[PDB]
Design a protein around this ligand. Structure first.
Ligand SMILES: N[C@H]1CC[C@@H](CNc2nccc(Nc3ncc(C4CC4)s3)n2)C[C@@H]1c1cccc(Cl)c1
Length: 291
């Protein structure tokens, strides 16, 4: 009954009177997401509402709130507060007007400059987390949020892990199959570089619209990751050499040879990044496409 630890972390007081103008903007396995407005303050917020029954290990909920409140950063969606509403947990975060990267990758064609701009900002989030001994473990386009200024922010700490010098590696088979690094899929001990792999897969989303093997069922994709290793692009000839190089460094099978987030921030690919204002036309296109 670590529900007591969860009960001591959360704020008390009715969120249903602190916040108004509730609108469902999202579903998800982890719960439903609503927008709302702080009754007093006017601030727009996103609230994730999670059924405590839905989650069998309430230990992960605790971990999610702590990591988020302890690791604030400009490239991470800001945690504001949390509340228990009966058997439902509400997490309140800053609302980022814009959209999901998923909408952009499925509905637009991104140029290398735009892709490099997104990758740089995500690598900055990862550098910060990994330096704070946190592995995200669920990097994908669905967890990247884009601001109306082209701000890029990472969210979702539902699956993350804290490591320590004593225990530098994890062994849970956690993530979303198509984005999971081979060492994770094959139950080897793994470290922060699983996030770099997932980032590589997200770069393939930005190129091709989908992670490798998405037409296949999840179990089949796990088999394909275990057997193929480094995925191949549909049309690699369409990419610059330096982009292909960046991809190769993100998607190295040899963990020790795979780029760290720090190493990758100095890659040549990132030097072609467009300014973040370059992403706002993608956001406009995606909103129009998903009317
Ligand atoms: N699957 C994802 C789809 C995209 C986004 C919802 N859609 C949307 N659309 C337009 C603006 C906007 N802005 C937001 N600012 C702050 C937000 C915090 C994350 C809540 S969201 N979100 C989030 C959602 C998500 C993230 C993490 C866990 C789960 Cl379970 C679900």
């Amino acid at each position: 009954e670590i529900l007591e630890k969860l009960r001591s972390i959360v704020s008390v007081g009715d969120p249903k009177k602190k916040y108004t103008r509730f609108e469902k903007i999202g579903q998800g396995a982890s719960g439903t997401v609503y927008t709302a407005m702080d009754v007093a303050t006017g601030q727009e917020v996103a609230i994730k509402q999670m059924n405590l029954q839905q989650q069998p290990k309430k230990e992960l909920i605790i971990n999610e709130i702590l990591v988020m409140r302890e690791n604030k950063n400009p490239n991470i969606v800001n945690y504001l507060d949390s509340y228990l509403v009966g058997d439902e947990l509400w997490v309140v975060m800053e609302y980022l007007a814009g959209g999901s990267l998923t909408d952009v990758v499925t509905e637009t064609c991104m140029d290398e400059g735009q892709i490099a701009a997104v990758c740089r900002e995500c690598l900055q989030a990862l550098e910060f987390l990994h330096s704070n001994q946190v592995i995200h473990r669920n990097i994908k386009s669905d967890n990247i949020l884009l601001g109306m200024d082209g701000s890029v922010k990472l969210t979702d700490f539902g699956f993350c892990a804290q490591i320590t010098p004593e225990q530098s590696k994890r062994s849970e088979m956690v993530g979303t199959p198509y984005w999971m690094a081979p060492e994770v899929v094959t139950r080897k001990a793994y470290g922060p570089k699983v996030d770099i792999w997932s980032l590589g897969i997200m770069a393939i989303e930005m190129i091709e619209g989908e992670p490798p093997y998405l037409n296949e069922n999840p179990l089949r994709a796990l088999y394909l990751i275990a057997t193929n290793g480094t995925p191949e692009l549909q049309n690699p000839e369409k990419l610059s050499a330096i982009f292909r190089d960046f991809l190769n460094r993100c998607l190295e099978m040899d963990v020790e040879k795979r780029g760290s987030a720090k190493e990758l921030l100095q890659h040549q690919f990132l030097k072609i990044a467009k300014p973040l204002s370059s992403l706002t036309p993608l956001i406009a296109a995606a909103k129009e496409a998903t009317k």
